[PDB]
Design a binder for this molecule. Structure first.
Ligand code: SF4
Ligand code: SF4
Ligand code: SF4
Ligand code: SF4
Ligand code: FES
Ligand SMILES: [K+]
Ligand SMILES: [Zn+2]
Lengths: 48, 230, 360, 126, 114, 208, 176, 96, 95, 113
């Protein structure tokens, strides 16, 4: 999180390099976020 | 001719002597709401939904059992008739269980349709509802007595048409229940017709249970071939 | 290089919408009007809702009336941004398209925060609105509209005094006042020709008679006057928005007739009369009394009317959709006579034509 | 006078655009719909309905859905009287059958008959 | 039984209009074959035109044949100008669909359709 | 009846009734019925042969001045011999009013085109043809406007099914988009939603 | 209540006409447009870094469909067929029968995701909050038949997205 | 809002406005994404007494259209409405 | 509580499985058959029956407005428990 | 006052409106002299034309003549007078004061069916 940025850039995620045995160093996916963090990342709430 | 002249909403109509108010209104084309009335059963007159106002008479009369008099003016759309219908709907829906999504009569329920048409749109009942123990009358009719409205079409059909005389009302007051009072099954050759005559989802078809819904079914008119009656 | 005849061929987006309406109930036919004019989504809901409520002899609650007008003016800002920036995009000024679409994205957040969908909300329903405004929504609307007058000025700086933009629009598509009425023109097409007419001022609906705004009137009937009228309508839409925020009343959002509008989910699961009404309204629907009516509102394109016929059942017998763009495209051949090939694409731009509503 | 006399029967089958397969091989049933026995209302038996025969519906190999090849399966037409339906069926060239309306016979109801003195119509209970 | 005519007072003017429409289509067919680059011959197209004309040749009401001539004229103007594509011209030639059974036995074998 | 019931407009009802009597008195040759609905809408049902004068009167009389043609519609009611009902909606900007003019035709009777009165109808009634088969005599350019070029039949007729009789797919053998008889993977489920109980006693029809 | 756009009479005196001549001889308004674009160059662009950053959404958002459960393992749907009766696109197909313990449960619940218009009528007509529109929107497939969800797929979606769907319902249900 | 003062001055000069007062990018001034729970009000028909539905039913008060003339003196000529009022020029900004 | 067919296919909670002679199994070759491993009947079987001291009981599924419509269950029969029609929870009178 | 523009595109400003309106109203009355008296159309439009002619004859000014004629500008009043003249000629051609030409069918205007 970085509250100094404007709305949209104030929260972000750096994806993992390996998820479920698939090498995701370059093949980052938008569906890799779990739902409990999917609520926080998409600005549905303030509380992580 | 011995016909007498009565009036429905100011419109004159000739009727035979002994005709009821409901039959005269059906003759002029108006269907009075009913729960316990059936044209092939004896008159009970207990649901009190058919209450209508006669002009210049300070008391509503049950149209299913009131014979017409000469010069009577029947007001089927008057204010106090609608008030009586709303009150009777409120009393009928006071103790009915919230079972419409899980009930097979949903979509073809007489109580639902007359509540939508002639009833009110909200409830003032802040108390708790009653619950009735379920009964077993065989593997043909699924029985949920909590949804019964004590219309007594069961006993009238089983006593006048089926000729079985095995159903009845046991108890008194709000605890009055329709049943056989013992572990007995209602097995006649015309038993399943009670599923047709129950206006609520108290008696449903056990093979048909939880399978379809009346709004999504296509109706094809055909002839039975199980016997030679046709 | 001149044009002597124009023959626009339509039917490439004829989905046959108004035949499918006859086989669906009044609630099910509501999202069909969202997809007619897909840049004026909540305005077409209001035209259909006002027609059904007229036949039902019911009226929306006062709070729902102010939400519909407030979101109607936000919808007018959505259409006028699209109708002007893409008009300049076809001409060649592609830069203000990207500036104003950032403001178009912020208003899409207002739709999705109140209804759940970014574009096709299905929010305005016969009897009021489906859901109330969430907490803190009107604070964000005030923050957006406070800075929006600067955004119109940046677009106005690029185009209004620019000599290249005027040369493409000064004497293109001049229509007279007498011929505009006979050709069925409406909205800015009448307004740009000097005819003083507006449906929100002459035949007002829900709370448009309680707000104050001005009606921009053109003087030459060309593409430039219709461009200036559309820009001025964005300024007047901000004026109504500030009045709607300060005059929003408390109360309910649906008509309290539970036989038309569904009850709350709290009382549906508690009282029996509400569960029966929730059962019948979402399966059969409310019965509309027999009759026919023609209800028209001032859509951002023009006059959007719906000729609705009911036969006493829970489904419409006939639902004719009158679109502003259907009559405007018929006059394309007349307006483009004697003009060049490149002047035609401005005339199809100076009439805000969405082919979802032209072909229906 | 600008009026001409045409005494031939109406026949618009060449103008409707329907293929002949759904013109000469279809049987149109004109009838008053029967009252649903689960309800006592009679408002659905006031108008005449004209419909067609039912053709084959089979199972989709993918999802088990009901697939059909009959376009006139969901066509139901409403007519005020029988003669309008007959004229519409003859105009469109559909071979049709019509069944007469069944009204209930007027019954004789008496509340006192439940308490007779010597008749079998006494009720065993009330 | 007195009705408002569309164009023809009797059957003679209607037959005259039918004759003009057939003449125009017979003149049109080679231009349609050459312009659209169809794979059919002029004989096939003219036989198709004659097939539709004989198929629709059992009517006796002047208004009906008047409307049929009107619709044929609309199709002729849609073919005169390049508004139809190759597909719309080849709609009359049903090549993709399998030929339906005609006798009783094959229809009995394939399904329940009468 | 205050909060949830739509208020009545009695002065508009009186004015519309007076103007309906005025129009029905000026033109007794063509008008057949004049009615005012409960929400103050004036309908003037006229003979089809007077579709040209009456509209012209409403376009040119100093007390009417219905200069705008808002809409033009056809309604298909199969139970009548004249199954097509043609509806003109007119708007008068001078007096700020709206009127409705209804005529009746069947499939074969032609209609005098109202292009010479209102130019917008030059497209509108043309669409009616493409949806209904109602022929408009003396039209400048009458053809299809919405359906496909090889389309047979008129879709908005109530005897036309929802899905048509043909549908398109690409065939690689002929390398072309071809039309075949329609075979739906899912049948359209028809729902019988009409309740068997009468809802509005005011619209009850007399029996037979 | 009306204003006259473009009805301005320009001054004919020497100063204003010389200003106009200097404007059309030295390109003043073109320089104004250039200055507008140059000033708009030095602003921070509003471009987010997808997929590392996501657009803002509300808990009313209608995305992928899911079938919920009670907090005991029992599924919420009791086969009442309200959602398939209210669905405007007829995307829902329901077939039901009583199961071994006698409960009213579905045996087939298909949603055609290529027919569905994502209108949320099913989740608002459900009396038990069984069917919901979840927050997921990144579920594009590579084959048409993958967008034909059956009961098992919707149950898997519900079990996958319950931890967010329950929170969204908790945050939103007071407005319903 | 992270720009230097030199770049801010350059933007203000080239644009012609003061852009720092009206920034299109949103910041901490917007509402919180989580809100306290609301308590919605009820309508006017949420009453226990004098709330009969027959006295507030809007659908049942709709009458069939009244027929003015049907085919089964010196009265003044009339109009559908009184003539419309001339629009007044705006006192706020008449653009004149 | 899933089970495995002798052809190697998993049986769903509705009892659906493809026969050995069915050709439709070719749609699963190279891919997987999607089944739900949480059976609702098995999961509701583990819930203990709640003992109450009244003739009738009221059930709404818990959570108030987040559950099912409220229903009333009679517990006069001592032989069997009173099961809720919506949530499947069962109750028993302790007397 | 020499009004600069009428504000309507394509509608030119008339130099002398009084004589033009008097000429149009007299022409309208002359045309209506051919319609039979018992026709209600002749009586009604004769009454309104006589009223408008009296107003335009008893008024020297232009602006308050416009404001009391209640017809917008005077140029659209002149246009409406010409339209009424053309309508009167067409009304003479059509003769719609005659009785009804045809009864409708029994249930032609019955809704709902
Ligand atoms: S009997 Fe009727 S009112 Fe009672 S639960 Fe069933 S559908 Fe509902
Ligand atoms: S179970 Fe049904 S038919 Fe029998 S008495 Fe009760 S309501 Fe009447
Ligand atoms: S969101 Fe709407 S279209 Fe989609 S399944 Fe639900 S009811 Fe049907
Ligand atoms: S509305 Fe809910 S409970 Fe009813 S069938 Fe649909 S998902 Fe199941
Ligand atoms: S129908 Fe008469 S009291 Fe029940
Ligand atoms: K029953
Ligand atoms: Zn429960």
């Amino acid at each position: 999180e970085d509250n100094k940025q404007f709305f949209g850039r104030h929260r972000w995620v750096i994806y993992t390099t390996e998820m479920n045995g698939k090498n995701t160093f370059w093949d980052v996916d938008g569906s890799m976020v779990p739902p409990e963090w999917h609520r926080w990342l998409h600005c549905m709430t303030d509380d992580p | 001719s011995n016909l007498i002249e009565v009036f429905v909403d100011g419109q004159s109509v000739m009727v035979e002597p002994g005709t009821t108010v409901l039959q005269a209104c059906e003759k002029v084309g108006m269907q009075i709401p009913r729960f316990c009335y059936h044209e092939r059963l004896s008159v009970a007159g207990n649901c009190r939904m058919c209450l209508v106002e006669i002009e210049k008479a300070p008391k509503v009369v049950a149209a299913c059992a009131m014979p017409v008099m000469k010069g009577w003016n029947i007001l089927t759309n008057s204010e106090k008739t609608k008030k009586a219908r709303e009150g009777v709907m409120e009393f009928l829906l006071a103790n009915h269980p919230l079972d419409c999504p899980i009930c097979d009569q949903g979509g073809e329920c007489d109580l639902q349709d007359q509540s939508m048409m002639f009833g009110s749109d909200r409830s003032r009942f802040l108390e708790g509802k009653r619950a009735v123990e379920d009964k077993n009358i065989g593997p043909l009719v699924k029985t949920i007595m909590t949804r019964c409205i004590q219309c007594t079409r069961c006993i009238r059909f089983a006593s006048e048409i089926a000729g079985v005389d095995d159903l009845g009302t046991t108890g008194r007051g709000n605890d009055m229940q329709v049943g056989t009072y013992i572990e007995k099954m209602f097995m006649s050759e015309l038993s399943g017709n009670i599923i047709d005559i129950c206006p609520v989802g108290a008696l449903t078809s056990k093979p048909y249970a939880f399978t379809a819904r009346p709004w999504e079914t296509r109706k094809t008119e055909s002839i039975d071939v199980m016997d030679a009656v046709g | 290089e001149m044009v002597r005849k124009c023959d626009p061929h339509i039917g490439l987006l004829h989905r046959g919408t108004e035949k499918l309406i006859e086989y669906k109930t009044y609630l099910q036919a509501l999202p069909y009007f969202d997809r007619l004019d897909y840049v004026s989504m909540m305005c077409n809901e209001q035209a259909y809702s006002l027609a059904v409520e007229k036949l039902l002899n019911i009226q929306p609650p006062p709070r729902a009336q102010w939400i519909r007008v407030l979101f109607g003016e936000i919808t007018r800002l959505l259409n006028h941004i699209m109708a002007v920036t893409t008009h300049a995009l076809d001409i060649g000024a592609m830069t203000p398209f990207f500036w104003m679409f950032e403001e178009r994205e912020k208003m899409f957040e207002f739709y999705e925060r109140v209804s759940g969908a970014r574009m096709h909300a299905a929010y305005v329903r016969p009897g009021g609105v489906h859901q109330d405004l969430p907490l803190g929504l009107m604070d964000d609307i005030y923050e957006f509209s406070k800075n929006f007058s600067l955004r119109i000025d940046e677009l106005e700086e690029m185009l209004t005094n620019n000599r290249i933009w005027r040369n493409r629009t000064v004497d293109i598509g001049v229509v007279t006042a007498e011929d505009a009425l006979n050709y069925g023109f409406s909205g800015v097409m009448l307004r740009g020709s000097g005819i003083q007419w507006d449906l929100r001022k002459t035949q007002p609906y829900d709370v448009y008679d309680q707000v104050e705004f001005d009606v921009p009137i053109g003087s030459r009937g060309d593409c430039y006057d219709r461009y200036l009228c559309r820009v001025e309508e964005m300024r007047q839409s901000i004026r109504i928005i500030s009045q709607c925020l300060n005059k929003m009343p408390p109360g309910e959002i649906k008509v309290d007739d539970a036989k038309v509008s569904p009850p709350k989910r709290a009382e549906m699961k508690t009282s029996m009369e509400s569960l029966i009404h929730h059962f019948k309204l979402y399966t059969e629907g409310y019965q509309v009394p027999p009759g026919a009516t023609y209800t028209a509102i001032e859509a951002p394109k023009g006059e959007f009317g719906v000729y609705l016929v009911s036969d006493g059942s829970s489904r419409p017998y006939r639902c004719k959709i009158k679109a502003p763009g259907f009559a405007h495209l018929a006059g394309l051949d007349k307006m483009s006579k004697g003009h060049m090939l490149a002047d035609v694409v401005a005339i199809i731009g100076t009439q805000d034509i969405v082919f979802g509503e032209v072909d229906r | 006078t600008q009026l001409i006399t045409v005494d031939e029967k109406l026949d618009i089958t060449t103008l409707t655009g329907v293929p002949e397969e759904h013109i000469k091989t279809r049987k149109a049933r004109i009838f008053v719909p029967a009252r649903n026995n689960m309800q006592s209302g009679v408002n659905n038996t006031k108008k005449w309905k004209m419909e067609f025969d039912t053709r084959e519906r089979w199972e989709n190999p993918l999802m088990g859905w009901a697939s059909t090849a009959d376009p006139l399966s969901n066509l139901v037409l409403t007519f005020s009287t029988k003669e309008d339906a007959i004229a519409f069926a003859e105009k469109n060239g559909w071979s049709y059958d019509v069944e007469e309306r069944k009204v209930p016979k007027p019954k004789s109801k008496s509340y006192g008959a439940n308490f007779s003195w010597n008749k079998r119509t006494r009720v065993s209970t009330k | 039984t007195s009705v408002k005519p569309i164009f023809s007072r009797d059957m003679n003017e209607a037959k005259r209009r039918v004759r003009e429409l057939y003449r125009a289509w017979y003149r049109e067919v080679p231009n349609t074959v050459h312009l659209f680059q169809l794979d059919i011959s002029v004989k096939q197209g003219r036989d198709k035109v004659r097939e539709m004309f004989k198929k629709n040749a059992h009517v006796t009401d002047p208004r009906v044949v008047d409307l049929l001539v009107i619709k044929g004229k609309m199709e002729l103007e849609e073919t005169i100008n390049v508004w139809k594509q190759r597909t719309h011209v080849m709609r009359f030639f049903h090549e993709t669909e399998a030929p339906r059974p005609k006798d009783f036995l094959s229809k009995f074998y394939v399904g329940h359709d009468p | 009846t205050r909060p949830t019931v739509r208020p009545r407009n009695d002065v508009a009802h009186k004015q519309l009734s007076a103007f309906g009597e005025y129009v029905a008195e000026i033109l007794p040759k063509y008008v057949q019925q004049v009615q005012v609905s409960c929400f103050s809408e004036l309908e003037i049902c006229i003979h089809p042969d007077g579709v040209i004068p009456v509209l012209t009167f409403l376009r040119d009389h100093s007390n009417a001045q219905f200069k705008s043609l808002a809409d033009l519609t056809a309604v298909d009611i199969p139970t009548r011999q004249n199954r097509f009902e043609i509806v003109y909606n007119l708007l008068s900007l001078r007096f700020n009013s709206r009127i409705r003019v209804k005529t009746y035709t069947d499939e074969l009777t032609p209609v005098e085109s109202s292009v010479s009165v209102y130019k917008a109808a030059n497209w509108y009634e043309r669409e009616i043809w493409d949806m209904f088969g109602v022929f408009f005599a003396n039209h400048p350019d009458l053809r299809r406007i919405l359906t496909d070029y090889g389309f047979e039949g008129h879709p908005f007729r109530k005897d036309f099914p929802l899905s048509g009789y043909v549908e398109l797919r690409y065939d690689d053998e002929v390398k072309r988009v071809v039309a075949e008889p329609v075979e739906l993977a899912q049948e359209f489920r028809k729902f019988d939603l009409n309740s068997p109980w009468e809802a509005f006693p005011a619209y009850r029809q007399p029996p037979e | 209540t009306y204003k006259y756009v473009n009805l301005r009479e320009p001054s004919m005196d020497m100063k204003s006409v010389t200003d106009r001549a200097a404007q059309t001889l030295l390109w003043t308004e073109l320089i104004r447009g250039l200055g507008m674009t140059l000033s708009y160059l030095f602003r921070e662009p509003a471009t987010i870094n997808y997929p590392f950053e996501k657009g803002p959404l509300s808990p009313r958002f209608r995305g992928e469909h899911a079938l919920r459960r009670y907090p005991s393992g029992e599924e919420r749907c009791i086969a009442c067929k309200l959602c398939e009766a209210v669905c405007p696109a007829q995307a829902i197909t329901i077939e039901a029968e009583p199961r071994a313990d006698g409960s009213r449960r579905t045996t087939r619940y298909d949603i055609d995701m290529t027919k569905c218009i994502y209108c949320g009528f099913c989740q608002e007509a459900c009396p038990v909050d069984a069917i919901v529109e979840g927050p997921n929107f990144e579920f594009s497939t590579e084959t048409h038949e993958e967008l034909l969800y059956n009961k098992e797929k919707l149950l898997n979606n519900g079990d996958k997205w319950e931890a967010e769907i329950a929170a969204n319902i908790q945050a939103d249900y007071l407005y319903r | 809002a992270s720009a230097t003062r030199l770049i801010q001055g350059l933007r203000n000069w080239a644009s012609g406005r003061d852009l720092q007062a009206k920034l299109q990018l949103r910041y901490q001034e917007i509402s919180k994404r989580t809100q306290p729970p609301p308590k919605l009000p009820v309508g006017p028909s949420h009453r226990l007494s004098n709330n009969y539905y027959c006295a507030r039913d809007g659908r049942r008060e709709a009458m069939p259209p009244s027929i003015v003339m049907s085919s089964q003196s010196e009265k003044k000529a009339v109009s559908p409405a009184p003539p419309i009022k001339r629009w007044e020029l705006s006192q706020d900004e008449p653009y004149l | 509580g899933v089970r495995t067919s002798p052809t190697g296919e998993k049986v769903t909670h509705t009892g659906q499985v493809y026969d050995d002679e069915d050709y439709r199994r070719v749609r699963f070759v190279g891919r997987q058959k999607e089944v739900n491993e949480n059976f609702a009947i098995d999961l509701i079987a583990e819930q203990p029956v709640s003992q109450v001291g009244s003739r009738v009981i009221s059930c709404d599924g818990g959570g108030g407005a987040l559950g099912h419509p409220r229903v009333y269950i009679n517990l006069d029969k001592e032989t069997k428990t009173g099961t809720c029609g919506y949530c499947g929870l069962q109750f028993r009178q302790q007397h | 006052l020499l009004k600069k523009t009428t504000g309507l595109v394509g509608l030119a400003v008339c130099e002398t409106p009084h004589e033009r309106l008097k000429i149009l109203y007299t022409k309208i009355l002359d045309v209506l002299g051919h319609i039979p008296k018992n026709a209600a159309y002749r009586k009604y439009t004769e009454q309104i034309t006589n009223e408008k002619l009296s107003i335009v004859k008893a008024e020297p000014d232009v602006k308050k003549l416009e404001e009391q004629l209640q017809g917008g500008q005077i140029e659209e009043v002149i246009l409406q007078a010409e339209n009424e003249l053309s309508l009167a000629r067409k009304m003479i051609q059509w003769k719609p004061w005659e009785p009804l030409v045809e009864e409708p069918p029994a249930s032609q205007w019955k809704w709902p069916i």
